[PDB]
């Protein structure tokens, strides 16, 4: 079992946090709030370095590319942004989606970027352009997550209309559909199982190759918010999530018991994520409490 401790609490963001995210690097972690804002704080000492600036209306996700350099935003304002992390800058706005833009990703070469709307729309943008390379009409529903696997090869996605279905990358076309609402989901680390949350107080990991169940996690309170759940790998191999309970649970991924849980937050916990190196998550939660915990475990 972890030990997770807290160990830093990130005030600053004015309205919810929506989606927090270490580097690749694992120097920083960014967060993104309704607040219309994007902050860089230090992953180790947690310190707050800058605020980055520009969306109209607030921001549900953030997403870095592989090399810690640029960071992409999905906001209310219909609109992505890309940005330079050490200039601040907003190197492109990506424009098509009717709706507001709710999830979004980089895929591993980084010169692509997925993004799913409440336009029901999955779109696939490049990086270097800025324009949007193709449009999956992909749910029926907003979509609530959009994640690439290891290579890029594929794109998985969510919506509340029930399904995820993944996508490969170079046609655009479905290759599998696996019903309350799906809430969020994500490929595991090998790109073998997709982890897949819905609004019943349940997750999931599947295997996507026999499109089966595996394993159910269950304890948490999720019936409204599309929380962030993650692998955890740097130490014991745990699932990591959110709740609507103010708390982060972890979970065992193979006998799926609850080994720990984090309390602290007043409000829901809406983002966790993983340090990619160290035993450390991030945690994040909505407007009754606005503040970005960092926790940290000896396994
Ligand atoms: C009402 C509810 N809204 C949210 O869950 C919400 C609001 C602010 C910030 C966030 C975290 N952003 C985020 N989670 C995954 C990718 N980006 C979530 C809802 C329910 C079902 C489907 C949808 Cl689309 C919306």
Avoid: M
């Amino acid at each position: 079992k972890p030990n997770y401790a807290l160990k830093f609490t990130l005030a600053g963001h004015t309205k919810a946090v929506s989606s927090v995210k270490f580097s690749p690097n694992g120097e920083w972690l960014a967060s993104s709030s309704a607040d219309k804002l994007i902050k860089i704080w230090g992953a180790y000492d947690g310190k707050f370095e800058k605020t980055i600036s520009g969306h109209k209306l607030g921001i549900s996700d953030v997403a870095w590319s592989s090399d810690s350099n640029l960071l992409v935003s999905a906001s209310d304002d219909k609109t992505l942004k890309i940005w330079d992390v050490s200039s601040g800058k907003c190197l492109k706005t990506l424009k098509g989606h009717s709706n507001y833009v709710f999830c979004c990703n980089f895929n591993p070469q980084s010169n692509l970027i997925v993004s799913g709307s409440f336009d029901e729309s999955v779109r696939i943008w490049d990086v270097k352009t800025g324009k949007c390379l193709k449009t999956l009409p992909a749910h029926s529903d907003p979509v609530s997550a959009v994640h690439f696997n290891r290579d890029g090869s594929l794109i998985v996605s969510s919506s509340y209309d029930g399904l995820c279905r993944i996508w490969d990358t170079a046609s655009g076309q479905c290759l599998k559909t696996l019903n309350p609402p799906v809430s969020f989901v994500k490929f595991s680390p090998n790109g073998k199982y997709i982890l897949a949350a819905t609004l019943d107080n349940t997750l999931k990991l599947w295997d996507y190759s026999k499109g089966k169940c595996l394993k159910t996690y269950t304890g948490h309170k999720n019936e409204k918010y599309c929380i962030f759940a993650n692998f955890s790998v740097t130490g014991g191999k745990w699932i990591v999530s959110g709740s609507e309970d103010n708390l982060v649970y972890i979970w065992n991924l193979q006998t799926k018991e609850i080994v720990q849980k984090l309390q602290g937050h007043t409000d829901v916990v809406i983002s966790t994520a993983c340090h990619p190196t160290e035993n450390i998550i991030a945690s994040a939660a909505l407007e009754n409490d606005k503040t970005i915990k960092l926790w940290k475990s000896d396994c």
